[PDB]
C-alpha cells in the first residue's frame, strides 16, 4: 500500500528485462494501473511521486507537509531543470520488443509500505480433516485445519440455482451424515439396534 | 481585526497516524482515514532492540528507508529513524493486464 489508501496485492512479477524501460535504462520496481486514480481522486499520490522524483534527483528531502505553499507548479518547474519532462512523464520502451510505447508513462519514486497480510498465512484447503466434538462438523480455523463455512446465504444462492443435489451433498456427505434408526410407531430415535 | 490568538501550526490538528500522509490536503477525506488505519499494519522496525525481546509475532523489514517526501511532523515521530517502507520506483501503466 502506498500512503494514500491504495492497497494492492502483487498480481505477477516480471523480471527486469521484461519490464518497460526508459531511455536511461531505468525499470520500474512496481507498476500500478491508471484506473486506480480517477475515482479515488487521490491526487496526493501523484504529487508525492512528482516531489520525490525531484528530491531524488536533487538530493534533498521533499517537504510534503500539509498546509504549506508548495505547489505543483513549483515542483513542476524544478523537475524541468533537472532535464525531465515537467509533469513526470517519460518515454518508455516496451520490454518485449524494445519498441517505443505510444503513450508516455508517469514515472518516479513513491513510498510504499508492505502490509501484514501475507498470502501464505491465508491459503487453506481441506478434504476430510477432524471434526468438532459436540456437533461433529469440521472444526474451524486455518490454524487447526478447519473447514470453510457454507453459510446461510450460500445456501440461498444454491437454491436460486436450483441445484438440489449439490445442496444436499454439501450439507450431508461433505459435513456430517449420520445413520440412525427410528421406531416406526413413536418416531423417536430410541431404537436399540444391535446391528451386529 | 480582533484576533486574540494564533494557531501554532495548522497542521497540528492531525494525530500521529495522519501525520505521515504526505499532502493530506490534496486527498479525498476517507482516503486519509484508510491510510491512517493501514499504516498501523505496515511493517518496519518497531524498536531498536527487537533482538532481545521475545514477543510473539514480530516483523522487521530488511532495508527500511526514510521517505523521500516527508512531513515536518514526521520529525517528532522518529519516523525517519524507524521508517516503515521503501521508496519503490513506480510506473502508472497498463502494461500487461496483470
Amino acid at each position: 500500500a502506498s500512503r494514500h489508501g491504495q492497497k494492492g496485492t502483487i498480481g505477477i512479477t516480471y523480471r527486469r528485462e521484461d519490464m518497460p524501460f526508459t531511455a536511461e535504462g531505468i525499470v520500474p520496481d512496481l507498476i500500478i494501473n491508471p484506473h486506480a486514480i480517477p475515482s479515488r481522486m487521490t491526487v496526493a499520490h501523484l504529487i508525492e511521486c512528482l516531489l520525490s522524483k525531484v528530491a531524488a534527483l536533487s538530493g534533498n528531502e521533499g517537504d510534503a507537509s500539509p498546509f504549506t505553499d508548495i505547489t505543483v507548479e513549483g515542483i513542476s518547474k524544478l523537475l524541468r531543470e533537472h532535464g525531465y519532462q515537467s509533469r513526470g512523464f517519460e518515454v518508455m520502451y516496451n520490454g518485449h520488443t524494445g519498441k517505443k510505447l505510444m503513450a508516455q508513462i508517469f514515472f518516479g519514486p513513491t513510498y510504499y509500505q508492505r502490509l501484514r497480510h501475507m498470502v501464505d498465512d491465508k491459503i487453506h484447503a481441506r478434504a476430510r480433516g477432524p471434526m468438532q466434538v459436540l456437533t461433529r462438523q469440521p472444526v474451524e480455523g486455518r490454524s487447526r485445519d478447519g473447514g470453510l463455512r457454507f453459510g446461510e446465504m450460500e445456501r440461498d444462492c444454491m437454491i436460486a440455482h436450483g441445484a438440489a443435489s449439490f445442496l444436499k451433498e454439501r450439507l450431508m456427505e461433505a459435513s456430517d451424515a449420520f445413520r440412525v434408526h427410528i421406531c416406526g410407531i413413536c418416531g423417536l430415535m430410541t431404537v436399540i439396534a444391535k446391528l451386529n | 481585526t480582533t484576533f486574540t490568538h494564533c494557531e501554532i501550526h495548522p497542521s497540528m490538528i492531525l494525530g500521529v497516524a495522519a501525520s505521515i500522509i504526505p499532502f493530506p490536503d490534496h486527498n479525498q477525506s476517507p482516503r486519509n482515514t484508510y491510510q491512517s488505519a493501514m499504516g498501523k499494519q505496515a511493517m518496519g522496525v518497531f524498536l531498536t532492540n527487537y533482538n532481545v525481546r521475545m514477543d510473539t509475532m514480530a516483523n522487521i523489514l530488511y532495508y527500511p528507508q526514510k521517505p523521500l517526501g516527508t512531513t515536518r511532523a514526521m520529525e517528532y515521530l522518529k519516523f525517519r529513524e524507524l521508517p516503515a517502507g521503501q521508496n519503490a520506483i513506480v510506473a502508472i501503466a497498463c502494461y500487461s493486464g496483470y
Binding site: 534533498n60 517537504d63 508548495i70 | -
Partner: peptide, 15 residues
Amino acid sequence: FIKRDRMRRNFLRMR
C-alpha cells in the same frame, strides 16, 4: 520546496 536540515549550520555560525 524541500526540507532543509542544514540550517543548523547558519544557526550555529550566526550565534
